[PDB]
Amino acid sequence: MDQTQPLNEKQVPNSEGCYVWQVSDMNRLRRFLCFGSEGGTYYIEEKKLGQENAEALLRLIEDGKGCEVVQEIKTFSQEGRAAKQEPTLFALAVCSQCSDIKTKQAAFRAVPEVCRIPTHLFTFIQFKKDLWGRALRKAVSDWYNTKDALNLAMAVTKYKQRNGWSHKDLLRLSHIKPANEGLTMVAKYVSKGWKEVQEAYKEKELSPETEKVLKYLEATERVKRTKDELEIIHLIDEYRLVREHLLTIHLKSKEIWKSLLQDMPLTALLRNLGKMTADSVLAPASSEVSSVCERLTNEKLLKKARIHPFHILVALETYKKGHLRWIPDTSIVEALDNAFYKSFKLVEPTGKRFLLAIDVSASMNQRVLGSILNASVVAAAMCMLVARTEKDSHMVAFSDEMLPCPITVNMLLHEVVEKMSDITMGSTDCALPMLWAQKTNTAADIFIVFTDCETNVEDVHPATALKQYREKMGIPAKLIVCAMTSNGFSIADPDDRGMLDICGFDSGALDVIRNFTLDL
Template sequence: MANIQLFKSLKRRLLPVADTMNYCGASAYALSKEHRLAQYAATGCLNHTFYASAQAQLATVLELSQEIAPRFIAQTALYARRRSYMKDMPALLLAVLAARGAEELVPAFEGTVDNGKMLRNFVQILRSGVTGRKSLGSRPKKLVQAWLNQATEEQLLHACVGQSPSLADVVKMVHPKPAEPWRAAFFAWLIGRPYDHAALPPLTRALCAYQRDRAQPIPQVPFQLLTAMQPSTEEWTQMARDGGWHMVRMNLNSFARHGVFEVPGMTELIAARLCDASAIAKARVFPYQLMAAWKACDETVPVAVREALQKAMEIALANVPTLEGTVVICPDVSGSMSNPISGVRAGVSSAVRCIDVAALLAAAILRKNGQSRVLPFDHRMVSCPLDPSDTVMVNAARLARIGGGGTDCSAPLRWLNEHGQRADLVILVSDNESWLRNHTSGATETLRQWQQFKQRNRKARLVCVDLAPHASSQAPESDDILNIGGFSDDVFRLLASFAAGQMQPQHWVDEIASMPL
């Protein structure tokens, strides 16, 4: 007789067998091609991550793009730019569409290239040859020309900030034919050709006047066009008054260094600007940008300004949903989460790490859902008491101070099972590279623990938020499991929709496929 223990009848539903391995060589579930592309687009910055190099990310995206319909590639580019606020990946996907000669390039370009930085990214990537061509080609060239001929003077001046290529390089490449005299004069001024000074638009004319005579009023142009002239305290103060919301956020230490906060009333003015709700909404503030500014502030920045950043965070996260039922948030605090959220690149790596973003998401949900429970984990459960009445920034900082250990995504589920806990929604926030308690066959340990949890909580749902560009998951998509990638505030909207039962299988891919072209 066969071994009864080995072949006994299963009392629970069959679990899907893990069908791939993750970067650590542990069992995992392969995401669909479309899901993989979306994951890379929403989290990949084409920089070195803890587990994958920039070259490997690029190769993966290019390989996937050859197997996926142009329409979905275009929709992914739109999603990555509009919902995830990414820059490099949407431009790369546009370049892929251009290389394939896809008609979807036109609506995708028009919906994705919303500023000069995106325009220059697109041109840079396409001209690099990585997508299979080095020339712009007629259709991309016409799209770039149209952008240059439709942009406002303010947009063009902002596009002047940056090199490789510069806006002047782009103009020389595509030779736009301007219909307005002011635009013709601007392009000639930009590329160093003779121009009619009287025909220049007002801001550019004011910039030229200021460059000739510093006694002239400071023009309200991007501050990067002025800092090379070594502005005085008075000039820095005027730039702080006139600067946009993001300009102020990014230059707090510079303001302190140049004496701006010593000018009467400037501390109060800047603090009020930073926590102005309408300005925050208009600036499309990325929550982790506020965390980056708060972390970067040195002691010379007044306390009132640093507190304003905390208030701004509360305002920026006002759309965090109130989730029905009992919610458990499980931020991964393992060693790999110490990697910068946008990857490593010499000189430009973000000070914000994956663990900071995981902590931010957990603290934000706790703040809006006071009865929630936060269970940090690495290879085991980690104790970190939090107070829902504290600010998001304070609680996030407490969580982010943990760090270390291996990764076991099943750890919080196992703890819930061992303690007989109940919950309606469990949220794992991780880089998803679980490698401990690995099984050589069958389902992953995460899925096994989730099935056990479901025996007590039949209506419960699991959301796995992946913060890094990966191709696999520890729990495959199903009616009660959602895998999403990204670290923008759109994650909160998706959480609410899924928790309310408003998303179907292949939830996230369907969300992207619904983007109108």
């Protein structure tokens, strides 16, 4: 029996016509939350991949798991497990208009929490349009009324974009009734303007909290009336204004940028590394560079700034590239490598024996999350994560034959990326890691295969190779399939308790791995 034939009646043909199992709908939802469907996969066009994922979600609802889905969405968003919020927002939108009364209600109830920032709310609304009753108005009203007025003021005072997204419109369409004076004030600022706010609040008794909102709006307005660097720096120092609150002429100043650098939100810092280096703002051997390195390697700050490991991987590739042109600062490059590991949810090692196998076949050249990184690079980063936490780990690579592993656990992340950028090619035999481990009599308690599961060679099924490995070696080895796309295929036998499906770049993947490895 080989891969071109069905192991049993539950198998389905993959893109290459070979047999695998359909990953469970709940696990496909997780694959979707983590990878989305932008750019599709090597074998599946973008729109089709999105529809496949939307259909899986619809089956879940149809099967009564609607509320479980919404709970899962809230959980991923709260724990910051996914690199992008789009998939999560699309899934929430789908749930807010489905056939299940209870799921609709649960979806709407989750909008204020799942839509963490303005962009999210706007994206969520656009998806609902894609797909204003009392429920939507209440949800939107709830979103504004549950946010901190000062934080809202901070967001609405940044420069606007011509993307059709308007707070003025949402405040109107939602028929909102502001719950506190600070929100009433910001709503007035958005709908009527600064002059109106000033006039409505002159002579007015305000709590110290509402007063802070008024003084902050005043600060953002003062920015526009001056080109004096010292005055602007004082405003950044006292009110923590960011780049988007400033005039273009202000952004021409190196000192203003240094003041902006001081408390720059980590996500913005990651995006501005190259520019600030080219601009001499992050000069070699500078205290500016040192502070940056310290903020990036502070696990508590990364978590609070919701920095996902994929954000760091992408930021690193972009920065190391050097082009706008700059000399990538070596200490920052090292800091990013360090931050990558600290951004995943850390767990105690299992001390077991791991065989980590990276698929470097042709289809793995497929791009991940709309980035320039291909699936083999991303898989390599996941493999490094595991190897770094589990001392007893041996890394291997494969296509339709075992291949020398281009990476070693001691390499820095930027090196891993370089080595894996053009390594993809050839057919795919997902049974190889187990077969190779057997032939070479290498001991492993856990096999983790990083792949898209599009196996397609006339060799034994990977599930088969695992069982043969178990028997011959006398080890009850488990197989963890770390999916690298949101397709719906899996080489793991749903009927074998010793096999599990997980998803690459789920920031809490190590916890899933730990629990399965120790039957916790």
